[PDB]
From Swiss-Prot:
Protein location: Lysosome; Secreted; Cytoplasmic vesicle, Phagosome
Described function: Thiol protease. Key protease responsible for the removal of the invariant chain from MHC class II molecules and MHC class II antigen presentation. The bond-specificity of this proteinase is in part similar to the specificities of cathepsin L.
CC terms in the record's Gene Ontology section: collagen-containing extracellular matrix; endolysosome lumen; extracellular region; extracellular space; ficolin-1-rich granule lumen; intracellular membrane-bounded organelle; late endosome; lysosomal lumen
Primary site of residence: other
Gene from which the chain derives: CTSS
Organism the protein comes from: Homo sapiens
Gene Ontology MF term list: collagen binding; cysteine-type endopeptidase activity; cysteine-type peptidase activity; fibronectin binding; laminin binding; proteoglycan binding; serine-type endopeptidase activity
Keywords per UniProt: Cytoplasmic vesicle, Disulfide bond, Glycoprotein, Hydrolase, Lysosome, Protease, Secreted, Signal, Thiol protease, Zymogen
Disulfide bonds: 12-110, 22-66, 56-99, 158-206
GO biological process: adaptive immune response; antigen processing and presentation; antigen processing and presentation of exogenous peptide antigen via MHC class II; antigen processing and presentation of peptide antigen; basement membrane disassembly; cellular response to thyroid hormone stimulus; collagen catabolic process; extracellular matrix disassembly
Subunit-level organization: Monomer.
Descriptive protein name: Cathepsin S
Residues of the full protein shown: 115 to 331 of 331
Length: 217
């Protein structure tokens, strides 16, 4: 496998989004994953509608809109619905709305998704190198996460119990300190232009490899 991977360099990652006061991290993680696959499968990169997921991937998928959700079941909604709209056509409003999906504005599809085995940072690495960005859950419930500015993030109080959906878009090392390159959805003023480099191969730090999944077009 490559020593470092950064899918931003392949034009597979859109601009970091600003979720506002809506707990839609799961929906951003999920669209971010499928955005990469769109680019890989079609050569087109188009930000996809996180709002579509918030509004439409609801009770049946175990999701509660601005009150949280799951990336896997967001992918299943996209599978079931045979599409998801572009962000531009169905823009993000940081709130719960009536479902307003329109097949006319479909910008991507999803045929399947794959769940990675619990805690396997090695398998996550392989998936990232060979499949694309991977949706993951992390334990972000720590001031250090919220306040992250730069460098490789390590929080000794982290557990493997996830509560925040983010997107692993790469991995590397910072002068030998290995990291996951994580795209968050708290605006580009969070971290390093909206990214956080999270400790890699430090015992499933903050649950990053607890529940990885990636969709396919
Ligand atoms: C609401 C949002 C908030 N995430 C978050 C976590 C820590 C935070 O701490 C702070 F403020 F310090 F950064 C801030 C925000 N979390 C989620 O959407 C999380 C996303 S999740 O935790 O990634 C879902 C998940 C994925 C894979 C395996 C298990 C769980 N879902 C969620 O809370 N749900 C699911 C549906 O039922 C309601 C509960
Ligand atoms: Cl959040
Ligand atoms: Zn914690
Ligand atoms: Zn969250
Ligand atoms: Zn920016």
């Amino acid at each position: 496998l490559p020593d470092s991977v950064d899918w931003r360099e392949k034009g597979c990652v859109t601009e970091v989004k600003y979720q506002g006061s809506c707990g839609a991290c799961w929906a951003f993680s999920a669209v971010g994953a499928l955005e990469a696959q769109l680019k890989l499968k079609t050569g087109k990169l188009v930000s996809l509608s996180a709002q579509n997921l918030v509004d439409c991937s609801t009770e049946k998928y175990g999701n509660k809109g601005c009150n949280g959700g799951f990336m896997t079941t967001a992918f299943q909604y996209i599978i079931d619905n045979k599409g998801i709209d572009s962000d531009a056509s169905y823009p993000y409003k940081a709130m719960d709305q009536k479902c307003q999906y329109d097949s006319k504005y479909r910008a991507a599809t999803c045929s399947k998704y794959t769940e990675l085995p619990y805690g396997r940072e090695d398998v996550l690495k392989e998936a990232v190198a060979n499949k694309g960005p991977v949706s993951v859950g992390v334990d972000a419930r720590h001031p250090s996460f919220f306040l992250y500015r730069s460098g490789v993030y390590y929080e000794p109080s982290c557990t493997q119990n996830v509560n925040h959906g983010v997107l692993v878009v790469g991995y590397g090392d910072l002068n030998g300190k290995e990291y996951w390159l994580v795209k968050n959805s708290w605006g580009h003023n969070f971290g390093e232009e909206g990214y956080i480099r999270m400790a890699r191969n430090k015992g499933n730090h903050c649950g990053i490899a607890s529940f990885p999944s990636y969709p396919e077009i």
